[PDB]
Amino acid sequence: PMNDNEKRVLREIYNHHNISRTQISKNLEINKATISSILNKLKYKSLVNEVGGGRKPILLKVNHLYGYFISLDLTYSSVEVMYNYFDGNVIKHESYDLPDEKVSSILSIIKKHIDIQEKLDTYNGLLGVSVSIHGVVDNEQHVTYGISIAKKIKEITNVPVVVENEANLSALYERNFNHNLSYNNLIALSIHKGIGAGLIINNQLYRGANGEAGEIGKTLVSKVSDNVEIFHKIEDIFSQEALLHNLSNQLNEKMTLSKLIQFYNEKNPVVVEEMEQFINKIAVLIHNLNTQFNPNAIYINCPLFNEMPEILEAIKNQFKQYSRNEIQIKLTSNVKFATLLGGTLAIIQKVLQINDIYLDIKA
Amino acid sequence: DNEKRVLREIYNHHNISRTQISKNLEINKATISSILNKLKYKSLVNEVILLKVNHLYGYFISLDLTYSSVEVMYNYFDGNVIKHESYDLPDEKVSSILSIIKKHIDIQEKLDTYNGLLGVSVSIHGVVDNEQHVTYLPFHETEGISIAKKIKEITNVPVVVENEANLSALYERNFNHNLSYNNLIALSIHKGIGAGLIINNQLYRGANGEAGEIGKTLVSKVSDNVEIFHKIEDIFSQEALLHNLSNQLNEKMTLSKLIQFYNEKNPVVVEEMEQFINKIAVLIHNLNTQFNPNAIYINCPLFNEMPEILEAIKNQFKQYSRNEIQIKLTSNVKFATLLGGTLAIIQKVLQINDIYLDIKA
Ligand SMILES: [K+]
Ligand SMILES: [K+]
Ligand SMILES: [K+]
Ligand SMILES: [K+]
């Protein structure tokens, strides 16, 4: 009957660390008697606990032992497995090598290394699974890029499942990480094999009509050759994979990220020249994203930049040649866990059926 | 605010019964009758069984500051057009705009309404930040003057200032609300390239009011082994097209001359048009991969004069994408911007955020 007000009070508890009963009442404009009644039902269901002059305030927190969630990240070479308490806090994290591209190999890892009957000292055990992918998910949870990998995971685990693009999940993470700065407009820019963007617009993850918003890697740019204008996808020019493939052709050897960093630190001229060009293209890309979306901030997740964070200053310096806008240009706020923790947020929101959980999980 | 909800229902459903309002809002008939009696008492609503927004409560002014004119639209309280006037703009000066406003608008005139002028919307070819500061006005000389403050001082009513493409997107939202297109773009192609963005049924302006300033996107061209970056509005805006045809044909090219030379099948013009159509198709593909809207509404004077070019854009778009995005021309050539302005001032004065009224003239 009071399902909505129970959800509202629970959301306040997630969003405000050790909030008082009276502060919940004030935030929601609901009388103290009704807030006390709602809290008693939430305490009775083991969802919330009380925290251990004049009257002492009653402080509330989410009961981390109510159950746990699993956040999965299906990368190009691994299966990342994160376990989170009901309050979002990290229990443990594991990384498994992915022997090949097969979905069967992913499912084999999930079956072999995840014990779904394990309660991890929680009352209800596994409550839900988030799945992060390097692909496109439509608004009806269909992976569009026999049976979907998410539905295959839903059957193996037998709990609610959410599937989402990795850049979209990282943007949810950045929304909550920078919520204290009120950055209600931001972009999580992903540069790896492709170029992807997680878009936060007016504090909401914007997915577009088909879940393809922020598929910036597919943007077409022209180059006139032999008096013929040819269009190319920007991710075929300056994704990290395109940079490595280009350098493999120029140096006539197989280039890996580790070799690129080594050759760059050694100041190999072919690599230095290509890096200056790559840095310039990314600076122009940030300018273009700013004139299109005009966010408060952009958070770049590029393995090369995470290994050499000083390149952020070269991007910022090159950006100044094109624009005087004060957009915050940053690297990802959490190299290891932004995507995984964004997944934790998405599964919490789905299982609870509560939007705008602003919880900033520190890990 | 149930009083605001009932008023919004009456705006959104022209002639709605007391029982239909009750059903739409899930509020009992007695409370709806009580709310309606207060709204009738305030002269905001009139009876026709059916309820209508009292058009004689007052009126609004919607202004459009174009490159060469000051467009002045008068609207009743229900949004209906009273009249529209167009004044020549002698020069770029903001002082000349204010002189026209002071000379041709009688703010004491009630126009048979009870309260007279209730508010003014101002549409500009430029950037307005979220604090109503005009931060970019390319074809007009500001001279330090605050458009918002100066029009508010002259008219003594609430004033909203907004980008023309943003106002056109607000107009398309109302026009295509029955199709539930909560994500759309109003693409403006004239001297520059601009976009009004509707995201999740709301006008998205960005952190500085610069969202959709797509004309400033930089693209590179290698010349004499040097990579040079250019703003796309300097390459394929309508002005840029006319400029490159002026250099190729060695004569001053106007829109009227372009259409004439195109219909005559002048080879320089026919090839440049095929290239222009292709660049706009790629632009729509790029906007779709960036924003992925339900629909895009293009406002380009060349396309409004030759609407069949929409089919050539749609055909060329299929070479790049299989997406089912609706590609259309503006739903109202003459008044989308002005009527979007009417909507923005109605929403501001009433403090009601999702009004879907669709008048066309
Ligand atoms: K990445
Ligand atoms: K995305
Ligand atoms: K100003
Ligand atoms: K705009």
XYZ file of C-alpha atoms and ligand atoms in Angstrom:
728
model
C 0.000 0.000 0.000
C 2.769 2.483 1.011
C 5.229 0.782 -1.472
C 6.198 4.130 -3.089
C 6.900 5.916 0.269
C 8.891 2.787 1.417
C 10.952 3.138 -1.780
C 11.371 6.926 -1.182
C 12.631 6.422 2.442
C 14.974 3.573 1.369
C 16.343 5.826 -1.454
C 17.046 8.634 1.110
C 18.995 6.106 3.236
C 21.138 4.989 0.251
C 21.701 8.661 -0.816
C 22.543 10.123 2.609
C 25.141 8.545 4.897
C 23.646 7.903 8.379
C 20.628 10.222 7.693
C 18.371 10.850 10.731
C 14.677 9.866 10.897
C 13.800 13.633 11.205
C 15.993 14.533 8.160
C 14.200 11.797 6.077
C 10.844 13.326 7.227
C 12.063 16.835 6.210
C 13.497 15.691 2.820
C 10.323 13.815 1.804
C 7.741 16.160 3.446
C 6.147 13.199 5.267
C 5.201 13.363 9.003
C 7.512 11.770 11.650
C 4.850 9.161 12.680
C 4.543 7.858 9.062
C 8.403 7.910 8.686
C 8.728 5.903 11.965
C 6.087 3.404 10.672
C 7.855 3.048 7.235
C 11.275 2.631 8.965
C 9.873 -0.100 11.279
C 8.646 -2.082 8.169
C 12.051 -1.572 6.424
C 13.852 -2.686 9.654
C 11.427 -5.657 9.967
C 12.287 -6.730 6.365
C 16.051 -6.487 7.336
C 16.595 -3.834 4.566
C 17.727 -1.076 6.986
C 19.323 -0.871 10.452
C 19.698 1.871 13.012
C 23.294 3.050 13.474
C 24.752 2.238 16.913
C 21.878 18.136 24.903
C 18.321 17.027 24.077
C 16.965 13.890 22.384
C 19.458 11.622 20.520
C 18.914 11.492 16.711
C 17.993 8.089 15.194
C 20.460 7.423 12.327
C 19.740 4.952 9.518
C 21.860 2.894 7.102
C 21.200 0.194 4.485
C 21.708 -3.324 5.925
C 24.742 -4.573 3.929
C 24.002 -8.168 5.072
C 20.492 -8.241 3.497
C 21.991 -9.900 0.419
C 24.611 -9.361 -2.235
C 24.892 -8.515 -5.930
C 27.256 -9.648 -8.642
C 28.646 -7.174 -11.187
C 30.244 -8.757 -14.282
C 32.444 -7.062 -16.891
C 33.018 -8.958 -20.133
C 36.221 -7.358 -21.482
C 38.212 -8.246 -24.621
C 40.506 -10.605 -22.640
C 38.815 -11.263 -19.258
C 35.726 -11.914 -17.154
C 35.710 -9.478 -14.248
C 33.609 -10.674 -11.289
C 32.707 -8.226 -8.486
C 30.637 -9.113 -5.362
C 28.838 -6.271 -3.554
C 26.858 -6.083 -0.321
C 23.250 -4.774 -0.385
C 24.645 -1.250 0.438
C 26.969 -1.473 -2.637
C 30.218 -2.079 -0.723
C 32.752 -4.395 -2.378
C 33.022 -7.847 -0.776
C 35.629 -9.190 -3.236
C 36.673 -8.981 -6.879
C 38.130 -11.648 -9.169
C 39.530 -11.545 -12.744
C 39.460 -14.589 -15.028
C 41.362 -14.992 -18.278
C 39.155 -15.324 -21.364
C 40.741 -18.020 -23.622
C 38.755 -16.960 -26.762
C 35.811 -14.849 -28.087
C 33.156 -17.647 -27.546
C 30.086 -16.868 -25.356
C 30.334 -20.583 -24.277
C 33.796 -19.782 -22.752
C 32.256 -16.811 -20.829
C 29.404 -19.042 -19.508
C 31.935 -21.804 -18.642
C 33.840 -19.272 -16.419
C 30.509 -18.095 -14.834
C 29.467 -21.729 -14.039
C 32.966 -22.803 -12.810
C 33.865 -19.787 -10.633
C 30.496 -18.504 -9.284
C 28.741 -20.454 -6.511
C 25.159 -19.056 -6.669
C 24.144 -20.980 -3.459
C 26.883 -19.187 -1.421
C 25.293 -16.630 0.949
C 28.566 -14.799 1.908
C 27.146 -14.256 5.453
C 24.116 -12.415 4.031
C 20.513 -13.356 4.831
C 19.177 -13.759 1.258
C 22.333 -14.443 -0.750
C 22.443 -13.443 -4.453
C 19.859 -10.747 -5.321
C 20.834 -9.853 -8.880
C 23.508 -9.716 -11.574
C 24.720 -6.827 -13.689
C 26.462 -7.650 -17.008
C 28.716 -5.057 -18.638
C 29.433 -5.497 -22.417
C 31.463 -3.803 -25.284
C 28.327 -3.622 -27.372
C 24.846 -2.152 -27.780
C 21.812 -2.988 -25.631
C 18.419 -1.618 -26.785
C 15.833 -0.164 -24.300
C 14.086 -3.595 -24.038
C 17.321 -5.355 -22.792
C 18.062 -6.959 -26.229
C 21.804 -7.106 -27.154
C 21.765 -5.775 -30.776
C 25.589 -5.020 -31.140
C 20.129 -18.176 -30.597
C 19.651 -16.876 -27.010
C 21.148 -13.681 -25.418
C 24.203 -13.958 -23.076
C 22.231 -12.020 -20.385
C 19.255 -14.483 -20.541
C 21.806 -17.382 -20.457
C 23.266 -15.764 -17.273
C 19.667 -15.195 -15.915
C 19.087 -18.974 -16.208
C 22.495 -20.023 -14.661
C 22.033 -17.609 -11.657
C 18.118 -17.534 -11.339
C 18.004 -13.822 -10.220
C 17.085 -10.504 -11.993
C 19.737 -9.514 -14.570
C 20.667 -6.224 -16.221
C 22.794 -5.966 -19.369
C 24.343 -2.610 -20.256
C 27.088 -1.039 -22.414
C 30.391 -0.546 -20.493
C 30.613 3.222 -21.298
C 26.991 3.742 -20.091
C 27.830 1.962 -16.804
C 31.013 4.061 -16.344
C 28.877 7.248 -16.878
C 26.490 6.069 -14.064
C 29.534 5.618 -11.872
C 30.827 9.137 -12.766
C 27.383 10.607 -12.097
C 27.506 9.319 -8.513
C 31.286 9.953 -8.024
C 30.806 13.681 -8.965
C 27.325 14.120 -7.509
C 28.858 16.370 -4.748
C 29.948 18.777 -7.562
C 26.371 18.666 -9.032
C 27.675 17.563 -12.467
C 24.230 16.581 -13.852
C 25.683 16.640 -17.426
C 28.724 14.498 -18.083
C 30.302 12.059 -20.515
C 32.282 8.880 -19.795
C 34.431 8.567 -22.956
C 35.734 5.045 -23.659
C 38.707 4.646 -26.101
C 39.818 1.036 -26.667
C 38.949 -1.116 -29.745
C 36.179 1.381 -30.516
C 35.153 4.831 -29.238
C 32.110 4.910 -26.976
C 30.448 7.432 -24.722
C 28.263 7.034 -21.692
C 25.983 10.115 -21.568
C 24.577 11.653 -18.396
C 21.978 14.271 -19.383
C 20.047 16.074 -16.627
C 21.270 13.413 -14.080
C 19.992 10.541 -16.207
C 21.731 7.955 -18.343
C 20.657 8.893 -21.878
C 20.483 5.789 -24.104
C 18.660 7.121 -27.179
C 15.645 5.597 -28.996
C 17.505 2.267 -29.698
C 20.175 2.320 -26.941
C 22.713 3.704 -29.480
C 23.256 7.235 -28.034
C 26.984 7.929 -27.557
C 28.078 5.476 -30.317
C 30.536 8.267 -31.288
C 33.027 5.746 -32.786
C 30.654 5.331 -35.785
C 30.794 9.112 -36.592
C 31.899 9.527 -40.228
C 34.710 11.911 -41.250
C 35.786 12.528 -44.846
C 39.199 12.528 -46.545
C 39.560 13.517 -50.220
C 41.794 11.044 -52.119
C 42.258 10.974 -55.935
C 39.596 13.799 -56.148
C 37.095 11.424 -54.349
C 35.677 12.202 -50.878
C 35.866 8.953 -48.814
C 34.070 8.642 -45.432
C 35.651 6.748 -42.536
C 34.429 5.840 -39.017
C 36.589 7.783 -36.481
C 37.160 4.546 -34.464
C 38.971 3.185 -37.594
C 41.291 6.262 -37.382
C 41.941 7.013 -33.694
C 40.549 4.341 -31.410
C 43.436 2.781 -29.398
C 43.215 -0.329 -31.687
C 43.467 1.891 -34.839
C 46.553 3.618 -33.397
C 48.220 0.233 -32.637
C 47.238 -1.208 -36.098
C 48.596 1.979 -37.821
C 51.900 1.710 -35.886
C 52.095 -2.038 -36.765
C 51.998 -1.072 -40.519
C 54.560 1.782 -40.076
C 57.030 -0.255 -37.908
C 56.306 -3.574 -39.782
C 55.961 -5.447 -36.435
C 53.050 -6.543 -34.203
C 52.268 -3.630 -31.899
C 50.791 -4.144 -28.440
C 49.989 -1.461 -25.846
C 53.092 -2.540 -23.841
C 55.320 -2.130 -26.947
C 53.726 1.259 -27.772
C 54.479 2.611 -24.218
C 58.075 1.215 -24.427
C 58.752 2.661 -27.914
C 57.149 6.018 -26.777
C 59.312 6.250 -23.587
C 62.396 5.426 -25.798
C 61.241 8.354 -28.021
C 61.049 6.261 -31.303
C 60.246 9.041 -33.872
C 57.531 7.069 -35.757
C 55.735 6.447 -32.411
C 56.291 10.032 -31.079
C 54.877 11.596 -34.332
C 51.833 9.296 -34.338
C 51.185 10.013 -30.606
C 51.232 13.823 -31.221
C 48.647 13.245 -33.989
C 46.611 10.881 -31.740
C 46.650 13.428 -28.827
C 45.507 16.177 -31.279
C 42.615 14.054 -32.672
C 41.406 13.275 -29.123
C 41.633 17.004 -28.181
C 39.474 17.849 -31.304
C 37.102 14.972 -30.372
C 36.649 16.543 -26.866
C 36.014 19.965 -28.506
C 33.384 18.342 -30.816
C 31.722 16.477 -27.910
C 31.589 19.782 -26.033
C 29.932 21.685 -28.919
C 27.453 18.803 -29.373
C 26.582 17.861 -25.742
C 28.200 20.756 -23.766
C 28.655 18.644 -20.569
C 30.117 19.895 -17.267
C 32.864 17.293 -17.596
C 34.296 14.473 -19.656
C 36.013 11.417 -18.094
C 38.248 9.523 -20.466
C 38.872 5.775 -20.059
C 41.724 4.848 -22.445
C 44.236 2.100 -21.393
C 47.151 4.131 -22.913
C 46.196 7.266 -20.835
C 45.719 5.179 -17.644
C 49.284 3.857 -18.117
C 50.658 7.390 -18.870
C 48.330 9.876 -17.018
C 50.604 12.871 -17.920
C 49.148 12.602 -21.518
C 45.957 14.221 -19.979
C 47.954 17.507 -19.713
C 49.035 17.185 -23.411
C 45.333 16.634 -24.376
C 44.319 19.694 -22.228
C 47.133 21.816 -23.824
C 46.124 20.748 -27.362
C 42.363 21.368 -26.501
C 43.218 25.088 -25.700
C 44.254 25.580 -29.385
C 40.614 24.894 -30.424
C 38.484 26.110 -27.469
C 38.420 28.471 -24.420
C 35.444 26.529 -22.816
C 36.008 25.556 -19.152
C 34.781 21.920 -19.590
C 36.506 19.657 -17.033
C 38.717 17.217 -18.978
C 39.670 14.272 -16.787
C 40.675 10.636 -16.833
C 38.249 8.027 -15.419
C 37.678 8.513 -11.656
C 38.311 4.805 -11.022
C 40.569 2.855 -13.456
C 39.946 -0.536 -11.848
C 36.280 -0.305 -10.848
C 34.264 2.521 -12.543
C 32.500 0.098 -14.981
C 31.987 -2.674 -12.381
C 30.621 -0.209 -9.753
C 28.382 1.407 -12.402
C 27.049 -2.165 -12.921
C 26.473 -2.489 -9.158
C 24.393 0.744 -9.295
C 22.359 -0.478 -12.289
C 21.470 -3.807 -10.626
C 20.615 -2.090 -7.272
C 18.260 0.285 -9.162
C 16.651 -2.599 -11.074
C 16.038 -5.016 -8.161
C 14.695 -2.223 -5.908
C 12.810 -0.462 -8.797
C 14.246 2.856 -7.533
C 15.723 5.417 -9.840
C 18.288 8.073 -8.841
C 20.294 6.171 -6.327
C 23.272 8.571 -5.923
C 25.375 6.151 -3.764
C 29.122 6.692 -4.363
C 30.783 3.315 -3.658
C 34.393 3.805 -2.607
C 36.748 0.997 -3.784
C -0.093 21.592 -7.434
C -3.391 20.099 -8.660
C -4.499 23.634 -9.747
C -1.445 23.615 -12.196
C -2.216 19.969 -13.273
C -5.867 20.820 -14.214
C -4.784 23.999 -16.062
C -2.119 21.908 -17.933
C -4.838 19.326 -18.928
C -7.023 22.146 -20.362
C -4.027 23.502 -22.413
C -3.103 19.955 -23.628
C -6.703 18.881 -24.523
C -8.348 21.994 -26.134
C -12.003 21.257 -25.107
C -11.916 18.783 -22.248
C -14.858 17.911 -20.007
C -14.737 18.092 -16.133
C -15.131 14.261 -16.094
C -12.312 13.718 -18.665
C -9.929 15.954 -16.574
C -10.933 13.877 -13.480
C -10.228 10.619 -15.391
C -6.886 11.846 -16.865
C -5.526 13.074 -13.498
C -7.135 10.356 -11.265
C -8.671 13.046 -9.008
C -12.354 12.909 -7.828
C -15.039 15.015 -9.643
C -15.756 17.150 -6.503
C -12.060 18.220 -6.218
C -11.910 18.851 -10.032
C -15.094 21.012 -9.781
C -13.540 22.939 -6.823
C -10.200 23.511 -8.716
C -12.129 24.575 -11.875
C -14.238 27.088 -9.865
C -10.989 28.762 -8.566
C -9.499 28.768 -12.138
C -12.811 30.216 -13.506
C -12.841 32.797 -10.654
C -9.284 33.901 -11.633
C -10.535 34.207 -15.324
C -7.864 31.623 -16.426
C -10.478 29.106 -17.692
C -13.910 29.510 -19.459
C -16.794 27.089 -20.146
C -17.901 26.185 -23.716
C -19.689 20.642 -20.326
C -16.279 21.506 -21.990
C -13.420 23.673 -20.630
C -11.165 26.029 -22.539
C -8.198 28.211 -21.557
C -9.611 31.741 -21.440
C -7.815 33.303 -24.450
C -8.872 36.796 -23.211
C -7.022 36.455 -19.850
C -4.070 38.270 -21.403
C -1.619 37.982 -24.269
C 2.036 37.148 -24.928
C 4.571 38.491 -27.364
C 6.983 36.142 -29.174
C 9.960 37.897 -30.851
C 12.391 36.427 -33.394
C 15.586 38.415 -33.992
C 16.705 37.261 -37.458
C 19.703 38.447 -39.532
C 17.583 41.076 -41.362
C 14.358 41.494 -39.354
C 12.485 41.690 -36.061
C 9.570 39.217 -36.174
C 6.774 40.126 -33.749
C 4.038 37.584 -32.926
C 1.080 38.296 -30.541
C -0.618 35.303 -28.886
C -3.695 34.965 -26.698
C -3.395 33.305 -23.258
C -4.376 29.950 -24.920
C -1.443 30.346 -27.413
C -3.591 31.278 -30.444
C -2.078 33.786 -32.865
C -3.664 37.260 -32.718
C -1.360 38.815 -35.364
C 2.210 38.748 -36.660
C 4.366 41.668 -37.932
C 7.831 41.779 -39.559
C 10.111 44.823 -39.246
C 13.219 45.547 -41.294
C 16.465 45.580 -39.314
C 18.604 48.497 -40.668
C 21.897 47.161 -39.146
C 23.468 44.617 -36.707
C 23.145 46.897 -33.585
C 21.146 45.633 -30.528
C 20.187 49.363 -30.081
C 18.390 49.188 -33.498
C 16.482 46.052 -32.296
C 15.433 47.871 -29.055
C 14.456 50.971 -31.109
C 12.043 48.748 -33.195
C 10.652 47.160 -29.948
C 10.095 50.678 -28.416
C 8.550 52.147 -31.656
C 6.274 49.287 -32.795
C 5.098 47.601 -29.565
C 2.453 49.392 -27.461
C 2.844 47.674 -24.042
C -0.263 49.523 -22.652
C -2.499 47.979 -25.388
C -4.765 45.301 -23.889
C -6.022 43.838 -27.256
C -9.472 43.216 -25.586
C -7.817 41.020 -22.924
C -8.300 41.541 -19.172
C -4.636 41.799 -18.114
C -2.879 42.796 -21.341
C 0.776 41.805 -21.864
C 1.804 38.845 -19.635
C 5.273 38.060 -20.978
C 7.767 38.193 -23.839
C 9.760 35.438 -25.503
C 12.922 36.449 -27.438
C 14.412 34.091 -30.065
C 18.039 34.628 -31.082
C 20.535 33.183 -33.583
C 23.045 32.732 -30.817
C 23.856 31.177 -27.464
C 21.984 31.881 -24.187
C 23.490 30.379 -21.015
C 21.278 28.813 -18.267
C 21.279 32.162 -16.319
C 19.683 34.056 -19.302
C 23.008 35.667 -20.422
C 23.516 35.993 -24.193
C 27.139 34.693 -24.561
C 27.313 34.465 -28.402
C 25.413 36.581 -30.942
C 27.317 36.354 -34.254
C 25.361 38.553 -36.748
C 24.509 41.293 -34.216
C 26.589 43.918 -32.337
C 25.758 43.657 -28.578
C 27.574 46.933 -27.499
C 27.513 45.600 -23.881
C 23.652 45.711 -23.784
C 21.775 42.901 -21.934
C 18.928 41.809 -24.290
C 16.972 40.073 -21.411
C 17.303 43.034 -19.004
C 16.666 45.747 -21.659
C 13.525 44.056 -23.120
C 12.346 43.419 -19.459
C 12.900 47.143 -18.692
C 11.000 48.280 -21.843
C 8.022 45.823 -21.427
C 7.925 45.412 -17.546
C 6.838 41.700 -17.846
C 8.676 38.306 -17.434
C 11.087 37.752 -20.387
C 12.610 34.508 -21.723
C 15.563 34.559 -24.170
C 16.367 31.376 -26.071
C 18.233 30.030 -29.127
C 16.048 29.738 -32.283
C 16.843 26.001 -32.848
C 15.985 25.221 -29.148
C 12.620 27.017 -29.606
C 11.947 25.082 -32.853
C 12.641 21.776 -30.958
C 10.141 22.809 -28.256
C 7.595 23.436 -31.096
C 8.296 19.952 -32.655
C 7.866 18.251 -29.228
C 4.324 19.597 -28.968
C 3.498 18.906 -32.649
C 4.796 15.301 -32.409
C 3.794 14.591 -28.767
C 0.908 12.318 -30.021
C 3.642 10.063 -31.564
C 5.473 9.987 -28.148
C 8.746 11.256 -29.722
C 10.421 12.106 -26.403
C 13.849 12.288 -28.202
C 14.126 14.589 -31.171
C 16.329 17.156 -32.909
C 15.330 20.387 -34.665
C 18.222 20.884 -37.143
C 18.690 24.484 -38.364
C 20.766 25.030 -41.596
C 21.079 28.652 -42.743
C 24.153 30.908 -42.177
C 25.255 28.448 -39.465
C 24.243 24.944 -38.337
C 22.357 24.587 -35.092
C 20.347 21.947 -33.306
C 17.612 22.112 -30.686
C 17.711 18.954 -28.612
C 14.731 17.277 -26.974
C 16.030 14.576 -24.609
C 13.541 12.578 -22.509
C 10.783 15.160 -23.404
C 12.894 18.087 -22.177
C 14.851 20.790 -23.928
C 18.499 19.914 -23.268
C 20.669 23.066 -23.195
C 23.939 21.709 -21.749
C 26.005 23.136 -18.834
C 26.506 26.538 -20.643
C 23.491 26.561 -23.002
C 25.767 25.349 -25.860
C 24.318 21.843 -26.445
C 23.501 21.379 -30.157
C 26.066 23.966 -31.391
C 26.927 21.406 -34.065
C 28.014 24.113 -36.571
C 31.231 24.557 -34.481
C 32.213 20.845 -34.932
C 35.764 20.716 -36.367
C 36.717 18.544 -39.356
C 40.193 18.317 -40.889
C 41.329 18.845 -44.477
C 44.967 18.241 -45.457
C 46.298 21.051 -47.707
C 49.978 21.408 -48.772
C 50.817 18.447 -46.399
C 49.275 20.476 -43.469
C 46.147 19.278 -41.603
C 43.791 22.298 -41.264
C 40.651 22.161 -39.045
C 37.440 23.841 -40.202
C 34.039 24.430 -38.596
C 31.407 22.370 -40.512
C 29.209 25.580 -40.768
C 32.013 27.037 -42.936
C 31.746 23.968 -45.274
C 28.110 22.854 -45.612
C 25.836 25.511 -44.057
C 23.455 27.027 -46.670
C 25.611 30.252 -46.693
C 28.800 28.156 -47.235
C 27.107 26.309 -50.200
C 26.098 29.640 -51.796
C 29.654 30.988 -51.099
C 31.433 27.990 -52.794
C 29.000 28.275 -55.792
C 29.790 32.052 -55.948
C 33.544 31.192 -56.324
C 32.910 28.372 -58.882
C 30.444 30.384 -61.073
C 32.295 33.744 -60.492
C 28.921 35.512 -59.753
C 27.009 36.505 -56.567
C 24.905 33.409 -55.730
C 21.564 33.899 -53.887
C 19.122 31.143 -52.869
C 16.811 32.174 -55.764
C 19.707 31.892 -58.276
C 20.748 28.498 -56.827
C 17.193 27.000 -57.291
C 17.001 28.529 -60.851
C 20.448 27.196 -61.900
C 19.573 23.777 -60.273
C 16.201 23.484 -62.133
C 18.082 24.460 -65.391
C 20.481 21.564 -64.542
C 23.698 23.737 -64.594
C 26.452 21.053 -64.180
C 28.495 22.993 -61.552
C 25.319 23.462 -59.436
C 23.980 19.846 -60.020
C 27.298 18.250 -58.811
C 27.647 20.652 -55.787
C 24.016 19.840 -54.787
C 24.719 16.029 -54.942
C 27.744 16.698 -52.643
C 25.635 18.984 -50.374
C 22.803 16.369 -50.145
C 25.435 13.685 -49.298
C 27.108 15.833 -46.555
C 23.687 16.522 -44.954
C 22.810 12.775 -45.128
C 26.187 12.000 -43.339
C 25.423 14.818 -40.838
C 22.043 13.113 -40.054
C 23.864 9.731 -39.667
C 26.415 11.395 -37.321
C 23.636 13.086 -35.280
C 21.884 9.698 -35.082
C 25.028 7.863 -33.851
C 25.631 10.660 -31.311
C 22.087 11.386 -30.020
C 20.050 8.472 -31.521
C 16.740 10.503 -31.561
C 13.319 9.222 -32.717
C 13.193 11.973 -35.318
C 15.031 14.889 -36.854
C 13.250 17.974 -38.283
C 15.331 19.982 -40.717
C 14.819 23.739 -41.155
C 16.828 24.780 -44.244
C 15.407 27.511 -46.604
C 16.680 25.538 -49.694
C 14.780 22.367 -48.583
C 11.628 24.361 -47.699
C 11.661 25.779 -51.268
C 12.339 22.321 -52.828
C 10.791 19.737 -50.379
C 11.520 16.824 -52.812
C 15.249 17.149 -51.746
C 14.101 15.444 -48.442
C 13.663 12.183 -50.462
C 17.201 12.579 -51.940
C 18.583 13.105 -48.370
C 16.610 10.013 -47.150
C 17.914 7.935 -50.146
C 21.534 9.068 -49.544
C 21.119 8.394 -45.737
C 20.324 4.660 -46.530
C 23.897 4.293 -47.967
C 25.310 4.956 -44.455
C 22.637 3.617 -42.062
C 19.740 1.099 -41.746
C 18.313 2.956 -38.639
C 14.596 3.823 -38.857
C 15.084 7.455 -37.595
C 12.305 9.691 -38.960
C 13.941 12.294 -41.243
C 11.565 15.210 -41.840
C 11.438 18.873 -42.752
C 10.318 21.444 -40.121
C 6.606 21.000 -39.268
C 6.026 24.794 -39.634
C 8.296 26.814 -41.985
C 6.919 30.232 -41.049
C 6.141 29.847 -37.355
C 7.904 26.874 -35.625
C 10.456 29.253 -33.929
C 7.907 31.960 -33.009
C 5.391 29.376 -31.662
C 8.197 27.585 -29.752
C 8.811 31.030 -28.170
C 5.085 31.296 -27.293
C 5.372 27.887 -25.546
C 8.521 28.889 -23.616
C 6.944 32.114 -22.278
C 3.638 30.309 -21.399
C 5.638 27.649 -19.458
C 7.695 30.322 -17.654
C 4.806 32.651 -16.574
C 2.607 29.676 -15.456
C 5.551 27.671 -13.981
C 4.160 24.536 -15.760
C 6.891 22.421 -17.422
C 5.151 20.111 -19.999
C 2.599 22.027 -22.037
C 1.778 20.380 -25.384
C -0.332 22.899 -27.236
C -0.213 22.694 -31.017
C -1.451 25.795 -32.897
C 0.069 26.320 -36.383
C -1.162 29.825 -37.512
K 38.365 1.525 -22.641
K 26.554 4.829 -25.082
K 23.236 39.273 -21.768
K 21.046 24.656 -29.525
